[PDB]
Chains A and B, each alone.
Chain A
Amino acid sequence: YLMEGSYNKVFLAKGNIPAESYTFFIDILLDTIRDEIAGCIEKAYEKILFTEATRILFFNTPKKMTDYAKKRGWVLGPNNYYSFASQQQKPEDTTIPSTELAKQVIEYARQLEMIV
């Protein structure tokens, strides 16, 4: 279930342990998914109010939303989580292909006329 986006069922299993305590393991598991939701807020979403992403984990209103809201963005606002969905700068690169392809075309010319 951790492979796909099964989250809520995983937090049902969390507790729904039939075998024994497993507490030290499900607390590492309680974290290594805390940073996972703490990344899952960072996708292209709308203005999330102070209830939805407040209750997606397992909290009512501590300052753990201040721990993550000051750790990452989606900053504390007027019932507001801020979307800095920019994704702008990285395209329009010809020069890096104008170096790599400058390598590759010469590599074509090496095994084309030069006898091997």
Chain B
Amino acid sequence: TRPANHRQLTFEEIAKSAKITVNEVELLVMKALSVGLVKGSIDEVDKRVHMTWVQPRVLDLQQIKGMKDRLEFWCTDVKSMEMLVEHQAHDILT
């Protein structure tokens, strides 16, 4: 659910969403790393974990519109940045 902006969460939030105490969630997430459904790091002193890789799930015909649109302006960055190389690098190769 969390975007690629942060995807970083706290043990208070985990304690809320799984309503389990503070001294069990670390044993949960070490098990999650052992299974390897998730890949990330654990900080203890700021009580936050830097989740990086997650198990890929399935999705409906609605998220493919989002991946379509994320694909779409990713095209025009290649167009726009490539056009500088074409136009400015023109005298180097005819």
Contact = CB atoms under 8 A, between A and B. Distances in A.
Q: Do chains A and B touch in the complex (CB under 8 A)?
A: yes
A103 B92 contact: no
Interface in B60-86: 81, 84-85
A110 interface: yes
B91 interface: yes
A115 to B, nearest CB: 11
Nearest to A102: B84
A109 interface: yes
Interface string A84-109: 00000000000000010011001001
Nearest to A110: B91
A106 B84 CA distance: 10
B4 interface: no
Interface residues of A, number: 8
A114 interface: yes
A110 B92 CA distance: 7
A114 B85 CA distance: 16
Contacts of B84: 99, 102-103
B59 interface: no
Contacts of A106: 85, 88-89, 92
A22 to B, nearest CB: 58
18 contacts: A99-B81, A99-B84, A102-B81, A102-B84, A102-B85, A103-B84, A103-B88, A106-B85, A106-B88, A106-B89, A106-B92, A109-B89, A109-B92, A110-B91, A110-B92, A113-B92, A114-B91, A114-B92
Given A102-B81, A110-B92, 6 more contacts: A102-B84, A106-B92, A109-B92, A110-B91, A113-B92, A114-B91
